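User: Can you fold this complex?
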Amino acid sequence: MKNFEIVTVTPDHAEQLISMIHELAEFEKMKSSVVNTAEKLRKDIENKAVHGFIAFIGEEPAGMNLFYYAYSTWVGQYLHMEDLYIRPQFRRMGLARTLWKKLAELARDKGIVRLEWAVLDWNKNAIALYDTVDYVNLTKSEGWFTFRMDGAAINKFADE
Amino acid sequence: MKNFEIVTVTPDHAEQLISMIHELAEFEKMKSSVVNTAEKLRKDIENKAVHGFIAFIGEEPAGMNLFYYAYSTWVGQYLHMEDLYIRPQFRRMGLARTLWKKLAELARDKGIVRLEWAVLDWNKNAIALYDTVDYVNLTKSEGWFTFRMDGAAINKFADE
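Assistant: Here's the predicted assembly.
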């Protein structure tokens, strides 16, 4: 057996992480939106802006998994999963899912009764993977829209 | 003119805040989903897990705007507005949006370049407001599902 160890994230890794945020600049087709550098990522891991796991193989990174803590006035705090990526040459070795499982474990160890994560409708890989658990699609079941409001509109709405 | 004052949420407010929560789950046809208490919440405002703005008129609570800090791998830390409710006898008095501003002023003041929030598809009153700013509908335009996994599911997958 090959040795995937999962390490939780310290800013020491932000280098490795910042690489894996650029690779993915290719694949989900939103390649120019890169404004979180390696340095800014450190300070974010430090100030607990973000959390994560890295899976390494031997001495190389193979995949990551970022996640922050979010709140819901019905249950209290929960976990949201942000990135869940595997460098190409390591997909379908089940790392994919394992990094998803340590966060599940972290949710148990913390009593958190809610994971969330968002995914593209056409991204049938992630659905394929996510299909191997019991989850609810919030969008369909309850009809929630997520609205976003980017920076230019953030400003003029404040400077009215 | 009629006076509405907005002060930032202190742990001391959790009493008034838990009440409005119930009114909103009541309105959003989800009375059961709520397990959070004032005193549980009372810890949660101390711990900077949630932030808010309460609207009082005289000494009566009217509405509230609660929110947490989310992280996108692409744009660092941004704000997510979880819950925004006005008591019924205080609608049509503008708070709706005003409470909403102090969160965009803050997002500006902290230099944050995205501001997300969600609503049900049938709550056309809530969209009625939201249509007076520039927002993207990430569900309908880009087809984003949000997958939830509750606690029963979280344990069953973490316990493999």
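Helices of chain A lie at 14-27, 38-46, 95-110, 124-130, 138-142, 151-158. Chain A touches chain B through 67 residues (CB under 8 Å).
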